[PDB]
Curated annotation (Swiss-Prot), chain A:
Component of the anaphase promoting complex/cyclosome (APC/C), a cell cycle-regulated E3 ubiquitin-protein ligase complex that controls progression through mitosis and the G1 phase of the cell cycle. The APC/C is thought to confer substrate specificity and, in the presence of ubiquitin-conjugating E2 enzymes, it catalyzes the formation of protein-ubiquitin conjugates that are subsequently degraded by the 26S proteasome. It is found in: Cytoplasm; Nucleus. Phosphorylated by CDC28, which is required for the early mitotic activity of the APC/C in its CDC20-bound form. Disulfide bonds: none annotated. Belongs to the APC3/CDC27 family. The gene is CDC27. The lineage of its organism: Eukaryota, Fungi, Dikarya, Ascomycota, Saccharomycotina. Present with 593 molecules/cell in log phase SD medium. The APC/C is composed of at least 13 subunits that stay tightly associated throughout the cell cycle: APC1, APC2, APC4, APC5, APC9, APC11, CDC16, CDC23, CDC26, CDC27, DOC1, MND2 and SWM1. It comes from Saccharomyces cerevisiae (strain ATCC 204508 / S288c). This is Anaphase-promoting complex subunit CDC27.
Length: 121, 124
C-alpha cells in the first residue's frame, strides 16, 4: 500500500506549496504515523520524517520539531536543515547541528538527491 | 530595452528560487529591488503586477503584515495573488475585511485584468 502514501505526500507538497499551514499538519501527522510502523530505515520513512519536521517547523511549533529532527537528523539532509533552523530559532542544541552539517558538507567535499519541496541546495 | 526584459525575468527567477528555499531576507531584498525597478514600466504591463504581487508575498512571509497589507491594498484589483495576500493580511489583523469580501467575491464569481500566472503561491 504505497500508492496511497505517495498520493498523500503529493497532496502535502501541493498544500504546503499553496501557502496553506495547519492543513499540512494533520496530513504530516498521518504520514508519520503510517510510515513509523512499516520501516525505520526506508527512504519513505526518512521522507515522512522530513515532511513532518517541515510541517511542524512552519506552523509555529518549534519545541516539538526540534527533537523530532534531532532524533533522525543523520538520515536526511533536509531533516538536518530543519533541525538547524529550529536550533537557531530556539537557541538550543547548536553543537550537534554544527556537527551534522559539517559532516554533510564534508560528504560533498569528499569524492542526498531528493527533490522534495523547500529542500535547500 | 533588449536587455531590459532579460533582467526582469532573471530577477523573477531569482525571487522564486529564493522563496522556494527557506531564505526570506534575500527574497525580501530581491522583491524590493524588482518592485523599485518596475516603477518605470506602465501599470498596464503584466511585469508591474507580477512584481507587486511578489513584493507583497515577500512582505507577508517576513511577518511584516502591515506593510504587506498596505502594498496589496494599493493594487488589490490588478492581480489575483495580490487579493490573496490582502485577504490573508485582513484575516491576520481584522482590518478592512469588507474590501476583502467585495474583491474576493468578484474574483471567484468571475472565474467560475490578470487572473492566472505561473508564479509561486498562486491560489487555486
Amino acid at each position: 500500500a504505497l500508492s496511497t502514501i505517495i498520493q498523500l505526500q503529493d497532496c502535502i507538497q501541493q498544500a504546503i506549496q499553496q501557502l496553506n499551514y495547519s492543513t499540512a499538519e494533520f496530513l504530516a501527522e498521518l504520514l508519520y504515523a503510517e510510515c513509523s510502523i512499516l520501516d525505520k530505515s526506508s527512504v519513505y520513512w526518512s521522507d515522512a520524517v522530513y515532511l513532518y519536521a517541515l510541517s511542524l517547523f512552519l506552523n509555529k511549533s518549534y519545541h516539538t520539531a526540534f527533537q523530532i529532527s534531532k532524533e533522525f537528523k543523520e538520515y536526511h539532509l533536509g531533516i538536518a536543515y530543519i533541525f538547524g533552523r529550529c536550533a537557531l530559532q530556539l537557541s538550543q542544541g547548536v553543537n550537534e547541528a554544527i556537527l551534522t552539517l559539517l559532516s554533510i558538507i564534508n560528504v560533498f567535499s569528499s569524492n542526498l538527491n531528493s527533490n522534495l519541496v523547500h529542500i535547500p541546495d | 530595452d533588449d536587455q531590459a526584459l532579460s533582467t526582469i525575468i532573471q530577477l523573477q527567477d531569482c525571487i522564486q528560487q529564493a522563496i522556494q528555499q527557506l531564505n526570506y531576507s534575500t527574497a525580501e531584498f530581491l522583491a524590493e529591488l524588482l518592485y523599485a525597478e518596475c516603477s518605470i514600466l506602465d501599470k498596464s504591463s503584466v511585469y508591474w503586477s507580477d512584481a507587486v504581487y511578489l513584493y507583497a508575498l515577500s512582505l507577508f512571509l517576513n511577518k511584516s503584515y502591515h506593510t504587506a497589507f498596505q502594498i496589496s491594498k494599493e493594487f488589490k484589483e490588478y492581480h489575483l495573488g495580490i487579493a490573496y495576500i490582502f485577504g490573508r493580511c485582513a484575516l491576520q489583523l481584522s482590518q478592512g475585511v469588507n474590501e476583502a469580501i467585495l474583491t474576493l467575491l468578484s474574483i471567484i464569481n468571475v472565474f467560475s485584468m490578470v487572473l492566472n500566472s505561473n508564479l509561486v503561491h498562486i491560489p487555486d
